[PDB]
Design a binder for this molecule. Structure first.
Ligand SMILES: *[C@@H]1O[C@H](CO)[C@@H](O[C@@H]2O[C@H](CO)[C@@H](O)[C@H](O)[C@H]2NC(C)=O)[C@H](O)[C@H]1NC(C)=O
Ligand SMILES: *[C@@H]1O[C@H](CO)[C@@H](O[C@@H]2O[C@H](CO)[C@@H](O)[C@H](O)[C@H]2NC(C)=O)[C@H](O)[C@H]1NC(C)=O
Length: 416
Protein backbone atom coordinates (compact mmCIF):
# COMPACT_ATOMS: atom_id res chain seq x y z
CA UNK A 1 0.00 0.00 0.00
CA UNK A 2 2.11 2.91 1.44
CA UNK A 3 5.79 3.31 0.41
CA UNK A 4 8.70 3.29 2.80
CA UNK A 5 9.22 6.28 5.13
CA UNK A 6 12.43 8.28 5.08
CA UNK A 7 14.67 8.28 8.15
CA UNK A 8 16.93 11.23 7.25
CA UNK A 9 16.86 14.32 9.55
CA UNK A 10 15.54 16.77 6.94
CA UNK A 11 15.73 20.51 7.66
CA UNK A 12 14.16 23.09 5.35
CA UNK A 13 15.18 26.76 5.08
CA UNK A 14 13.37 29.37 3.01
CA UNK A 15 16.01 31.47 1.22
CA UNK A 16 15.36 34.85 -0.39
CA UNK A 17 17.00 37.42 -2.55
CA UNK A 18 16.06 40.91 -1.39
CA UNK A 19 17.14 43.45 -4.04
CA UNK A 20 19.28 46.40 -2.94
CA UNK A 21 17.15 49.16 -1.48
CA UNK A 22 14.06 47.08 -0.72
CA UNK A 23 13.46 47.50 3.03
CA UNK A 24 11.05 45.65 5.29
CA UNK A 25 10.59 47.04 8.82
CA UNK A 26 11.83 44.34 11.26
CA UNK A 27 15.18 37.31 8.61
CA UNK A 28 16.32 34.32 6.54
CA UNK A 29 19.64 33.43 4.87
CA UNK A 30 20.10 34.81 1.40
CA UNK A 31 20.21 32.85 -1.83
CA UNK A 32 23.86 33.92 -2.17
CA UNK A 33 24.80 32.75 1.35
CA UNK A 34 22.89 29.47 0.98
CA UNK A 35 24.47 28.73 -2.41
CA UNK A 36 28.06 29.53 -1.35
CA UNK A 37 27.52 27.22 1.64
CA UNK A 38 26.21 24.41 -0.57
CA UNK A 39 29.32 24.73 -2.76
CA UNK A 40 31.77 24.96 0.16
CA UNK A 41 30.45 21.66 1.55
CA UNK A 42 30.16 19.69 -1.70
CA UNK A 43 32.38 16.60 -1.70
CA UNK A 44 31.02 14.36 -4.51
CA UNK A 45 28.31 15.64 -6.86
CA UNK A 46 26.47 18.76 -8.02
CA UNK A 47 23.52 18.70 -10.42
CA UNK A 48 22.10 21.98 -11.68
CA UNK A 49 18.95 22.30 -13.75
CA UNK A 50 19.02 25.81 -15.21
CA UNK A 51 17.32 28.19 -17.66
CA UNK A 52 20.31 30.45 -18.56
CA UNK A 53 23.65 31.64 -17.16
CA UNK A 54 24.63 35.35 -16.73
CA UNK A 55 26.79 35.40 -13.61
CA UNK A 56 29.24 38.18 -14.61
CA UNK A 57 29.09 41.83 -15.60
CA UNK A 58 30.66 40.77 -18.89
CA UNK A 59 27.60 38.59 -19.60
CA UNK A 60 25.19 41.53 -19.19
CA UNK A 61 27.43 44.32 -20.61
CA UNK A 62 27.21 46.29 -17.35
CA UNK A 63 29.67 47.55 -14.74
CA UNK A 64 27.70 47.01 -11.57
CA UNK A 65 29.36 46.41 -8.19
CA UNK A 66 26.32 44.38 -7.20
CA UNK A 67 27.34 41.71 -9.75
CA UNK A 68 30.18 40.65 -7.38
CA UNK A 69 28.11 38.00 -5.58
CA UNK A 70 27.30 36.37 -8.93
CA UNK A 71 30.97 36.46 -9.97
CA UNK A 72 32.01 34.88 -6.67
CA UNK A 73 29.41 32.13 -7.26
CA UNK A 74 30.97 31.40 -10.69
CA UNK A 75 34.50 31.34 -9.20
CA UNK A 76 33.46 28.80 -6.54
CA UNK A 77 31.71 26.58 -9.10
CA UNK A 78 34.96 26.47 -11.11
CA UNK A 79 36.79 24.91 -8.15
CA UNK A 80 34.46 21.91 -7.88
CA UNK A 81 35.43 19.59 -10.74
CA UNK A 82 39.20 20.11 -10.17
CA UNK A 83 38.82 18.98 -6.53
CA UNK A 84 36.93 15.86 -7.67
CA UNK A 85 33.24 16.89 -7.51
CA UNK A 86 31.18 15.55 -10.41
CA UNK A 87 29.37 18.60 -11.80
CA UNK A 88 26.49 18.13 -14.27
CA UNK A 89 24.66 21.17 -15.65
CA UNK A 90 21.50 20.96 -17.72
CA UNK A 91 20.61 24.24 -19.42
CA UNK A 92 17.81 25.31 -21.79
CA UNK A 93 18.82 25.60 -25.43
CA UNK A 94 18.57 29.30 -26.40
CA UNK A 95 16.37 30.09 -29.38
CA UNK A 96 19.17 31.73 -31.33
CA UNK A 97 22.96 31.80 -31.06
CA UNK A 98 24.09 33.22 -27.74
CA UNK A 99 27.48 33.62 -26.03
CA UNK A 100 28.04 31.06 -23.26
CA UNK A 101 31.02 32.39 -21.30
CA UNK A 102 30.00 30.94 -17.91
CA UNK A 103 29.35 27.48 -19.28
CA UNK A 104 32.61 27.54 -21.27
CA UNK A 105 34.52 28.42 -18.10
CA UNK A 106 32.86 25.54 -16.28
CA UNK A 107 33.57 23.12 -19.16
CA UNK A 108 37.18 24.29 -19.10
CA UNK A 109 37.14 23.58 -15.34
CA UNK A 110 35.93 19.98 -15.92
CA UNK A 111 32.17 20.25 -15.42
CA UNK A 112 29.80 18.43 -17.79
CA UNK A 113 27.21 20.56 -19.59
CA UNK A 114 24.25 19.54 -21.75
CA UNK A 115 21.90 21.85 -23.65
CA UNK A 116 18.30 20.59 -23.64
CA UNK A 117 16.18 21.39 -26.70
CA UNK A 118 12.69 21.40 -25.21
CA UNK A 119 11.49 23.28 -28.30
CA UNK A 120 12.18 20.16 -30.41
CA UNK A 121 10.78 17.86 -27.72
CA UNK A 122 7.66 19.66 -26.45
CA UNK A 123 7.52 23.19 -27.96
CA UNK A 124 8.53 24.49 -24.50
CA UNK A 125 11.72 25.46 -22.63
CA UNK A 126 13.77 24.02 -19.79
CA UNK A 127 12.66 26.57 -17.18
CA UNK A 128 13.28 24.75 -13.90
CA UNK A 129 15.87 25.95 -11.42
CA UNK A 130 17.26 23.53 -8.89
CA UNK A 131 20.51 22.21 -7.44
CA UNK A 132 21.17 18.77 -5.97
CA UNK A 133 24.30 18.47 -3.84
CA UNK A 134 25.92 15.15 -2.89
CA UNK A 135 22.55 13.42 -3.28
CA UNK A 136 21.73 14.93 0.12
CA UNK A 137 20.75 18.61 -0.14
CA UNK A 138 18.85 20.57 -2.77
CA UNK A 139 17.84 24.09 -3.71
CA UNK A 140 14.49 24.51 -5.44
CA UNK A 141 13.12 28.00 -6.15
CA UNK A 142 12.91 31.00 -8.48
CA UNK A 143 16.55 32.18 -8.65
CA UNK A 144 18.35 31.72 -11.99
CA UNK A 145 22.10 31.30 -12.53
CA UNK A 146 22.19 35.07 -12.79
CA UNK A 147 23.98 37.74 -10.73
CA UNK A 148 20.81 39.86 -10.98
CA UNK A 149 19.10 36.98 -9.15
CA UNK A 150 21.26 37.64 -6.09
CA UNK A 151 21.06 41.43 -5.74
CA UNK A 152 18.64 43.12 -8.17
CA UNK A 153 15.62 40.78 -8.22
CA UNK A 154 13.43 39.48 -5.42
CA UNK A 155 13.61 35.64 -5.20
CA UNK A 156 12.11 32.83 -3.09
CA UNK A 157 13.41 29.28 -2.79
CA UNK A 158 13.90 26.51 -0.28
CA UNK A 159 17.05 24.58 0.66
CA UNK A 160 16.31 21.10 1.96
CA UNK A 161 19.28 19.94 4.03
CA UNK A 162 20.20 16.38 5.05
CA UNK A 163 17.35 14.82 3.09
CA UNK A 164 18.92 12.24 0.81
CA UNK A 165 15.63 10.47 0.05
CA UNK A 166 14.02 13.59 -1.38
CA UNK A 167 17.26 14.73 -3.09
CA UNK A 168 17.47 11.38 -4.85
CA UNK A 169 13.85 11.86 -5.92
CA UNK A 170 14.86 15.20 -7.42
CA UNK A 171 17.86 13.66 -9.16
CA UNK A 172 15.38 11.45 -11.03
CA UNK A 173 13.86 14.57 -12.61
CA UNK A 174 17.36 15.87 -13.36
CA UNK A 175 18.19 12.52 -15.03
CA UNK A 176 15.33 12.96 -17.49
CA UNK A 177 16.78 16.40 -18.40
CA UNK A 178 20.24 14.85 -18.69
CA UNK A 179 18.98 12.09 -21.01
CA UNK A 180 17.12 14.56 -23.26
CA UNK A 181 20.23 16.77 -23.51
CA UNK A 182 21.80 14.15 -25.77
CA UNK A 183 21.95 14.16 -29.56
CA UNK A 184 19.16 12.10 -31.05
CA UNK A 185 17.09 12.07 -27.87
CA UNK A 186 13.31 11.85 -28.01
CA UNK A 187 10.78 11.34 -25.26
CA UNK A 188 10.35 7.59 -24.62
CA UNK A 189 6.83 6.25 -24.81
CA UNK A 190 7.50 4.76 -21.37
CA UNK A 191 10.23 5.99 -19.09
CA UNK A 192 12.30 3.15 -17.58
CA UNK A 193 11.88 2.25 -13.90
CA UNK A 194 15.17 4.10 -13.14
CA UNK A 195 13.17 7.38 -13.46
CA UNK A 196 9.94 6.38 -11.71
CA UNK A 197 9.00 7.17 -8.12
CA UNK A 198 6.70 5.87 -5.40
CA UNK A 199 6.27 9.35 -3.89
CA UNK A 200 3.45 11.49 -5.23
CA UNK A 201 0.10 13.08 -4.46
CA UNK A 202 -1.57 9.77 -3.54
CA UNK A 203 1.30 8.52 -1.34
CA UNK A 204 3.69 11.34 -0.34
CA UNK A 205 7.01 10.61 1.27
CA UNK A 206 6.78 10.52 5.08
CA UNK A 207 9.70 12.60 6.32
CA UNK A 208 10.93 13.97 9.61
CA UNK A 209 11.10 17.71 8.88
CA UNK A 210 12.77 19.93 11.50
CA UNK A 211 11.95 17.24 14.04
CA UNK A 212 8.28 16.50 13.37
CA UNK A 213 6.50 14.29 10.79
CA UNK A 214 5.68 15.79 7.41
CA UNK A 215 4.35 14.63 4.01
CA UNK A 216 6.47 15.77 1.06
CA UNK A 217 6.61 15.08 -2.66
CA UNK A 218 8.04 16.58 -5.84
CA UNK A 219 5.88 17.28 -8.90
CA UNK A 220 7.11 17.68 -12.47
CA UNK A 221 6.16 19.32 -15.78
CA UNK A 222 5.48 18.85 -18.63
CA UNK A 223 3.36 15.59 -18.60
CA UNK A 224 5.52 13.83 -21.27
CA UNK A 225 8.45 14.06 -18.84
CA UNK A 226 6.50 12.42 -16.00
CA UNK A 227 6.94 8.70 -15.39
CA UNK A 228 3.76 7.00 -14.19
CA UNK A 229 4.42 7.55 -10.44
CA UNK A 230 5.38 11.24 -10.84
CA UNK A 231 2.57 13.70 -10.06
CA UNK A 232 2.26 16.43 -12.74
CA UNK A 233 2.88 20.01 -11.55
CA UNK A 234 -0.61 21.23 -12.52
CA UNK A 235 -2.29 18.34 -10.70
CA UNK A 236 -0.24 19.02 -7.54
CA UNK A 237 -1.04 22.77 -7.64
CA UNK A 238 -4.79 22.22 -8.14
CA UNK A 239 -4.87 19.75 -5.29
CA UNK A 240 -3.53 22.33 -2.81
CA UNK A 241 -6.15 24.79 -4.16
CA UNK A 242 -9.02 22.26 -3.95
CA UNK A 243 -8.05 21.14 -0.42
CA UNK A 244 -7.85 24.68 1.02
CA UNK A 245 -10.53 25.47 3.59
CA UNK A 246 -9.58 28.93 4.97
CA UNK A 247 -7.18 30.85 2.67
CA UNK A 248 -5.03 30.62 -0.45
CA UNK A 249 -2.09 33.03 -0.68
CA UNK A 250 -0.39 33.05 -4.08
CA UNK A 251 2.72 35.05 -4.92
CA UNK A 252 3.61 34.51 -8.57
CA UNK A 253 5.42 36.78 -11.02
CA UNK A 254 2.92 36.27 -13.87
CA UNK A 255 -0.59 34.82 -13.87
CA UNK A 256 -2.46 34.36 -17.10
CA UNK A 257 -5.39 31.99 -17.76
CA UNK A 258 -4.13 31.47 -21.32
CA UNK A 259 -1.57 29.50 -23.30
CA UNK A 260 0.74 32.52 -23.56
CA UNK A 261 2.11 33.33 -27.03
CA UNK A 262 -0.11 31.02 -29.07
CA UNK A 263 -0.66 32.51 -32.53
CA UNK A 264 -4.36 31.65 -32.29
CA UNK A 265 -4.97 32.90 -28.73
CA UNK A 266 -5.94 30.04 -26.39
CA UNK A 267 -7.99 30.40 -23.22
CA UNK A 268 -6.82 28.22 -20.31
CA UNK A 269 -9.05 28.43 -17.21
CA UNK A 270 -7.65 25.50 -15.16
CA UNK A 271 -6.17 27.50 -12.26
CA UNK A 272 -8.66 30.36 -12.71
CA UNK A 273 -11.64 28.08 -12.10
CA UNK A 274 -9.88 26.40 -9.16
CA UNK A 275 -9.59 29.78 -7.43
CA UNK A 276 -13.16 30.71 -8.33
CA UNK A 277 -14.43 27.35 -6.97
CA UNK A 278 -12.43 27.69 -3.75
CA UNK A 279 -13.80 31.17 -2.99
CA UNK A 280 -17.41 30.53 -4.06
CA UNK A 281 -18.00 26.93 -2.85
CA UNK A 282 -15.87 26.92 0.31
CA UNK A 283 -15.58 30.60 1.30
CA UNK A 284 -11.82 30.50 0.93
CA UNK A 285 -10.02 33.82 1.26
CA UNK A 286 -7.89 34.17 -1.87
CA UNK A 287 -5.03 36.69 -1.96
CA UNK A 288 -3.13 36.94 -5.26
CA UNK A 289 0.11 38.92 -5.29
CA UNK A 290 1.22 39.33 -8.90
CA UNK A 291 4.45 41.07 -9.87
CA UNK A 292 4.51 44.03 -12.23
CA UNK A 293 7.26 45.76 -14.15
CA UNK A 294 7.92 47.24 -17.56
CA UNK A 295 7.86 43.78 -19.19
CA UNK A 296 4.52 42.61 -17.81
CA UNK A 297 2.06 41.36 -20.39
CA UNK A 298 -0.74 43.99 -20.37
CA UNK A 299 -3.56 41.47 -21.02
CA UNK A 300 -3.05 40.25 -17.41
CA UNK A 301 -4.95 43.27 -16.13
CA UNK A 302 -8.40 42.34 -17.44
CA UNK A 303 -8.10 38.75 -16.12
CA UNK A 304 -6.94 40.00 -12.68
CA UNK A 305 -9.84 42.47 -12.56
CA UNK A 306 -12.20 39.65 -13.53
CA UNK A 307 -11.04 37.66 -10.47
CA UNK A 308 -11.21 40.75 -8.19
CA UNK A 309 -14.81 41.41 -9.24
CA UNK A 310 -15.87 38.25 -7.38
CA UNK A 311 -15.61 39.93 -3.94
CA UNK A 312 -19.17 39.96 -2.51
CA UNK A 313 -20.19 40.62 1.10
CA UNK A 314 -23.14 38.21 0.98
CA UNK A 315 -21.72 35.22 -0.95
CA UNK A 316 -18.60 35.05 1.32
CA UNK A 317 -16.65 35.34 -1.93
CA UNK A 318 -13.37 37.07 -1.10
CA UNK A 319 -10.70 37.31 -3.80
CA UNK A 320 -8.23 40.18 -3.56
CA UNK A 321 -5.49 41.04 -6.01
CA UNK A 322 -2.46 43.29 -5.47
CA UNK A 323 0.56 44.06 -7.64
CA UNK A 324 4.04 43.89 -6.11
CA UNK A 325 6.43 46.41 -7.66
CA UNK A 326 10.16 46.58 -6.95
CA UNK A 327 11.24 50.25 -7.07
CA UNK A 328 14.03 51.21 -9.46
CA UNK A 329 16.10 54.39 -9.04
CA UNK A 330 17.99 55.91 -12.01
CA UNK A 331 21.09 53.71 -11.76
CA UNK A 332 19.02 50.60 -11.05
CA UNK A 333 16.79 51.33 -14.06
CA UNK A 334 19.87 50.92 -16.32
CA UNK A 335 20.30 47.24 -15.33
CA UNK A 336 18.61 45.11 -18.03
CA UNK A 337 15.83 42.79 -16.82
CA UNK A 338 16.01 43.58 -13.11
CA UNK A 339 13.97 45.11 -10.28
CA UNK A 340 11.10 42.63 -10.25
CA UNK A 341 9.81 40.00 -7.83
CA UNK A 342 10.41 36.50 -9.34
CA UNK A 343 8.73 34.55 -6.51
CA UNK A 344 6.46 31.57 -7.36
CA UNK A 345 4.79 29.89 -4.39
CA UNK A 346 1.42 29.17 -2.80
CA UNK A 347 0.49 28.74 0.86
CA UNK A 348 -2.81 27.73 2.46
CA UNK A 349 -3.84 27.20 6.07
CA UNK A 350 -2.62 23.57 5.61
CA UNK A 351 -0.15 23.19 2.70
CA UNK A 352 2.88 24.71 0.95
CA UNK A 353 3.71 24.77 -2.76
CA UNK A 354 7.08 26.16 -3.92
CA UNK A 355 7.55 26.15 -7.69
CA UNK A 356 9.81 27.25 -10.52
CA UNK A 357 7.04 28.17 -12.99
CA UNK A 358 4.76 31.08 -13.66
CA UNK A 359 1.01 30.43 -13.72
CA UNK A 360 0.07 30.30 -17.40
CA UNK A 361 -0.81 27.22 -19.44
CA UNK A 362 2.44 26.57 -21.33
CA UNK A 363 4.36 26.17 -18.09
CA UNK A 364 2.18 23.18 -17.23
CA UNK A 365 1.78 21.52 -20.63
CA UNK A 366 5.04 22.12 -22.58
CA UNK A 367 7.72 23.71 -20.43
CA UNK A 368 9.85 21.99 -17.80
CA UNK A 369 9.06 22.84 -14.18
CA UNK A 370 9.17 21.33 -10.72
CA UNK A 371 7.47 22.02 -7.44
CA UNK A 372 7.83 20.90 -3.85
CA UNK A 373 4.66 20.08 -1.91
CA UNK A 374 4.74 19.80 1.87
CA UNK A 375 1.94 19.21 4.35
CA UNK A 376 2.67 19.05 8.07
CA UNK A 377 0.39 19.00 11.10
CA UNK A 378 0.85 21.54 13.79
CA UNK A 379 1.26 25.26 14.15
CA UNK A 380 4.58 26.65 12.95
CA UNK A 381 7.03 25.05 10.59
CA UNK A 382 7.82 25.71 6.95
CA UNK A 383 4.17 26.58 6.22
CA UNK A 384 3.92 29.41 8.78
CA UNK A 385 7.30 30.78 7.72
CA UNK A 386 6.04 31.05 4.12
CA UNK A 387 2.74 32.61 5.26
CA UNK A 388 4.79 35.20 7.17
CA UNK A 389 6.85 36.09 4.09
CA UNK A 390 3.63 36.46 2.12
CA UNK A 391 1.97 38.71 4.68
CA UNK A 392 5.17 40.74 4.92
CA UNK A 393 5.05 41.35 1.15
CA UNK A 394 1.26 41.79 1.05
CA UNK A 395 1.26 44.50 3.75
CA UNK A 396 4.41 46.25 2.53
CA UNK A 397 4.28 49.54 0.60
CA UNK A 398 5.53 47.66 -2.49
CA UNK A 399 2.05 46.07 -2.91
CA UNK A 400 -0.65 48.01 -4.71
CA UNK A 401 -4.35 47.67 -5.46
CA UNK A 402 -5.25 47.57 -9.12
CA UNK A 403 -6.65 51.11 -9.04
CA UNK A 404 -3.22 52.49 -7.99
CA UNK A 405 -1.69 55.33 -10.02
CA UNK A 406 1.27 54.35 -12.17
CA UNK A 407 3.26 57.27 -10.71
CA UNK A 408 3.00 55.86 -7.15
CA UNK A 409 4.80 52.52 -7.54
CA UNK A 410 8.43 53.59 -8.06
CA UNK A 411 8.95 51.70 -11.35
CA UNK A 412 7.51 51.22 -14.82
CA UNK A 413 4.37 49.06 -14.58
CA UNK A 414 2.33 48.02 -17.59
CA UNK A 415 -0.64 46.82 -15.51
CA UNK A 416 -1.35 50.26 -13.99
C1 LIG B 1 22.82 18.69 8.54
O1 LIG B 1 23.80 17.66 8.96
C2 LIG B 1 25.07 18.14 9.38
C3 LIG B 1 25.93 16.91 9.65
O2 LIG B 1 25.41 15.99 10.62
C4 LIG B 1 24.85 19.03 10.60
O3 LIG B 1 26.11 19.58 10.95
C5 LIG B 1 26.60 19.23 12.25
O4 LIG B 1 25.76 19.63 13.34
C6 LIG B 1 26.31 19.23 14.60
C7 LIG B 1 25.23 19.34 15.66
O5 LIG B 1 24.25 20.32 15.36
C8 LIG B 1 27.53 20.09 14.87
O6 LIG B 1 28.06 19.82 16.16
C9 LIG B 1 28.58 19.82 13.80
O7 LIG B 1 29.64 20.77 13.92
C10 LIG B 1 28.00 19.91 12.37
N1 LIG B 1 28.94 19.38 11.38
C11 LIG B 1 29.35 18.10 11.20
C12 LIG B 1 28.83 17.06 12.17
O8 LIG B 1 30.12 17.80 10.30
C13 LIG B 1 23.88 20.18 10.28
O9 LIG B 1 23.64 20.93 11.46
C14 LIG B 1 22.55 19.65 9.71
N2 LIG B 1 21.74 20.74 9.22
C15 LIG B 1 22.12 21.58 8.24
C16 LIG B 1 21.12 22.64 7.91
O10 LIG B 1 23.22 21.52 7.66
C1 LIG C 1 14.71 24.14 10.31
O1 LIG C 1 16.12 24.01 10.56
C2 LIG C 1 16.91 25.01 9.88
C3 LIG C 1 18.36 24.67 10.14
O2 LIG C 1 18.68 24.79 11.52
C4 LIG C 1 16.51 26.41 10.34
O3 LIG C 1 17.27 27.41 9.65
C5 LIG C 1 18.07 28.27 10.48
O4 LIG C 1 17.32 29.37 11.02
C6 LIG C 1 18.09 30.33 11.76
C7 LIG C 1 17.10 31.30 12.37
O5 LIG C 1 16.08 30.59 13.07
C8 LIG C 1 19.09 30.99 10.83
O6 LIG C 1 19.82 32.03 11.49
C9 LIG C 1 20.02 29.90 10.30
O7 LIG C 1 20.95 30.47 9.39
C10 LIG C 1 19.22 28.78 9.60
N1 LIG C 1 20.11 27.69 9.22
C11 LIG C 1 20.56 27.47 7.98
C12 LIG C 1 21.50 26.32 7.81
O8 LIG C 1 20.21 28.17 7.02
C13 LIG C 1 15.02 26.61 10.08
O9 LIG C 1 14.59 27.88 10.56
C14 LIG C 1 14.23 25.52 10.77
N2 LIG C 1 12.81 25.69 10.54
C15 LIG C 1 11.89 25.52 11.50
C16 LIG C 1 10.46 25.72 11.09
O10 LIG C 1 12.20 25.22 12.66
Amino acid sequence: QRPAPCYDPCEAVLVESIPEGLDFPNGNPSTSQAWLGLLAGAHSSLDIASFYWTLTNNDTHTQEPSAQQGEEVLRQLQTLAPKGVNVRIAVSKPSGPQPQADLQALLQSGAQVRMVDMQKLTHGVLHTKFWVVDQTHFYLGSANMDWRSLTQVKELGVVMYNCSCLARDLTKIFEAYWFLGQAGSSIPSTWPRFYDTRYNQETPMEICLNGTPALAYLASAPPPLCPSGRTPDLKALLNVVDNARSFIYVAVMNYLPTLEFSHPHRFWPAIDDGLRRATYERGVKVRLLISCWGHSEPSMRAFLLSLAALRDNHTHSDIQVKLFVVPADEAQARIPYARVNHNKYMVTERATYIGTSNWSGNYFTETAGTSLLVTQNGRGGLRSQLEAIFLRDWDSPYSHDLDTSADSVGNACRLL
